[PDB]
From Swiss-Prot, chains A, C:
The M4 transmembrane segment mediates tetramerization and is required for cell surface expression. The chain holds residues 723 to 772 of 883 of the full protein. Belongs to the glutamate-gated ion channel (TC 1.A.10.1) family. GRIA2 subfamily. It is found in: Cell membrane; Postsynaptic cell membrane; Postsynaptic density membrane. Detected in forebrain. Detected in dendrites of neuronal cells. Expressed in the pyramidal cell layers of CA1 and CA3 and in the granule cell layer of the dentate gyrus. The gene is Gria2. This is Glutamate receptor 2. Ionotropic glutamate receptor that functions as a ligand-gated cation channel, gated by L-glutamate and glutamatergic agonists such as alpha-amino-3-hydroxy-5-methyl-4-isoxazolepropionic acid (AMPA), quisqualic acid, and kainic acid. L-glutamate acts as an excitatory neurotransmitter at many synapses in the central nervous system and plays an important role in fast excitatory synaptic transmission. It comes from the Eukaryota. Palmitoylated. Depalmitoylated upon L-glutamate stimulation. L-glutamate binds at E4. The postsynaptic actions of L-glutamate are mediated by a variety of receptors that are named according to their selective agonists. This receptor binds AMPA (quisqualate) > L-glutamate > kainate. Induction: Down-regulated in the pyramidal cell layer of CA1 in the hippocampus by global ischemia.
């Protein structure tokens, strides 16, 4: 099964302790807080993340 | 530190002695402030070499 | 010696062959074209990168 890096860690940290990660990151995407087009909250929250 | 001089490829670019810089250069926060960047070529990370 | 990932990957395929990428990426960084702030070329570059 394929999934993201951080999701693969947290299942491994829970305690049935039966899942391991092999290999490394196949790529590097990113998580971000998203607002639609025309949302005036997008630019203040973008600076709030920073 | 203590003098704030852009040394190498950014020494040509920030100080205006060149126009474009096609190079494996890292977009960082203090890099972003002084001069504009393009989109990333590829996604990468810090890797250990032994 | 920690360094860039694909720079570490290139030496591993080049044939002195005594080098090894271990683990995986430890960060995420971007290879972008350094352009001047308010570039004369950046907005044509930004789509032509994409």
């Amino acid at each position: 099964y394929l999934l993201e890096s951080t999701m693969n860690e947290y299942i491994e940290q829970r305690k049935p302790c039966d899942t391991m990660k092999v290999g490394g990151n196949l790529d590097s995407k990113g998580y971000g807080i998203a607002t639609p087009k025309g949302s005036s909250l997008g630019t203040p929250v973008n600076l709030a993340v920073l | 530190a203590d003098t704030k001089i852009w040394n190498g490829m950014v020494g040509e670019l920030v100080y205006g002695k060149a126009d474009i810089a096609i190079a494996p250069l890292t977009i960082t926060l203090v890099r972003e402030e002084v001069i504009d960047f393009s989109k990333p070529f590829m996604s990468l990370g810090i890797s250990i070499m032994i």
